[PDB]
mmCIF file of C-alpha atoms in Angstrom:
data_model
loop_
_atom_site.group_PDB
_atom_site.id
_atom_site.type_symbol
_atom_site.label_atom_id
_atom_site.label_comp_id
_atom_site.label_asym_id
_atom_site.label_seq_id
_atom_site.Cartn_x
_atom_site.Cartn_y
_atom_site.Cartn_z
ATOM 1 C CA UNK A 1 -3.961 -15.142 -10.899
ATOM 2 C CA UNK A 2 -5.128 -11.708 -11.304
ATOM 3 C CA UNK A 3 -8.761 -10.574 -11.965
ATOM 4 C CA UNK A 4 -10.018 -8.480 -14.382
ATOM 5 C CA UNK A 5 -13.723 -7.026 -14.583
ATOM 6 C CA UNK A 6 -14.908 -4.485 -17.586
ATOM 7 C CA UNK A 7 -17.625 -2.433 -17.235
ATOM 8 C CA UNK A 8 -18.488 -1.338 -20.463
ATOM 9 C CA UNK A 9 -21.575 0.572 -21.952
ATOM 10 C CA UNK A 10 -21.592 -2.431 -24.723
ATOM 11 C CA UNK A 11 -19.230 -4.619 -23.615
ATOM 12 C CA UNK A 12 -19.915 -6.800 -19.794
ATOM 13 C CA UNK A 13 -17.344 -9.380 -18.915
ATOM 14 C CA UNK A 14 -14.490 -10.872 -17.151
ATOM 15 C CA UNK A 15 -11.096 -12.444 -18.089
ATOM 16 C CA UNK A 16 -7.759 -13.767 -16.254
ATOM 17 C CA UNK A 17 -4.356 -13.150 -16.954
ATOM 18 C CA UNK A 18 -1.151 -14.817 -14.987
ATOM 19 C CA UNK A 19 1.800 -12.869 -14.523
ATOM 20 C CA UNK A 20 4.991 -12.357 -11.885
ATOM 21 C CA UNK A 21 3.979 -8.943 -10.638
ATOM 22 C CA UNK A 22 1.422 -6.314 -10.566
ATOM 23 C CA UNK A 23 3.004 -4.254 -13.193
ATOM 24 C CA UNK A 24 3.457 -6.894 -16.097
ATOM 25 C CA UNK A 25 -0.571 -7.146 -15.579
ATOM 26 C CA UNK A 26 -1.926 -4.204 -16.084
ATOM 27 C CA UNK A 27 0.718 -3.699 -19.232
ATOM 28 C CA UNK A 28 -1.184 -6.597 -20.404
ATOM 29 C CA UNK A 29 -4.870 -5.761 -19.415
ATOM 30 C CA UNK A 30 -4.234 -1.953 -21.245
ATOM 31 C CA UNK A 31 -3.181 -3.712 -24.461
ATOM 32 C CA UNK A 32 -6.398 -6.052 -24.220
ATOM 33 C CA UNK A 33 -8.577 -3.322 -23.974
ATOM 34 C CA UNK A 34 -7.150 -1.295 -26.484
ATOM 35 C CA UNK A 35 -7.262 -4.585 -28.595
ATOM 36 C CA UNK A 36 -11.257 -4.499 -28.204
ATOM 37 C CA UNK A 37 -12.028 -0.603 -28.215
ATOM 38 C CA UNK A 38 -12.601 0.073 -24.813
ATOM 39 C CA UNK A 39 -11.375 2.710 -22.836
ATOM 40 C CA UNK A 40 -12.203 4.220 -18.885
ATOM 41 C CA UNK A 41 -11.372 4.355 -15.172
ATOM 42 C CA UNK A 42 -8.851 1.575 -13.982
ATOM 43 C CA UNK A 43 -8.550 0.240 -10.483
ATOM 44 C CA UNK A 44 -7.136 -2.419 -8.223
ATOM 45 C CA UNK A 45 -7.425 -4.199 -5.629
ATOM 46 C CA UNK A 46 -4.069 -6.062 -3.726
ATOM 47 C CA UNK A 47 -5.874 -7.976 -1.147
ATOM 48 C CA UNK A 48 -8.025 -9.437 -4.193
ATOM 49 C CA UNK A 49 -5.654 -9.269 -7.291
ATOM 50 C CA UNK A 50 -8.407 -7.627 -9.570
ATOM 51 C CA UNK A 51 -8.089 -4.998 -11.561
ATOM 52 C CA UNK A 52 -11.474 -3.253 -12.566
ATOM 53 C CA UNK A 53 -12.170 -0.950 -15.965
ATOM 54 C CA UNK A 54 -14.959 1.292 -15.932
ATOM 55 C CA UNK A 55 -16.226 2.784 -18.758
#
């Protein structure tokens, strides 16, 4: 695998995660961004396994 793309005002990037299911993700992604003080809009995309945070 899964995608996921953070649009920060100071922070740009991209990192990957693997996991069995959707839901193990995005528990993971939310602590990550926690982890580097960002906070927004989630979304996701099934037919491309990326999960987007806006911000």
């Amino acid at each position: 695998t899964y995608k996921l793309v953070i649009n920060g005002k100071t922070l740009k990037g991209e990192t990957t995660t693997k996991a069995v299911d959707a839901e193990t993700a995005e528990k993971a992604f939310k602590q990550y961004a926690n982890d580097n003080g960002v906070d927004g809009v989630w979304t996701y995309d099934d037919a491309t396994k990326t999960f987007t945070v806006t911000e």
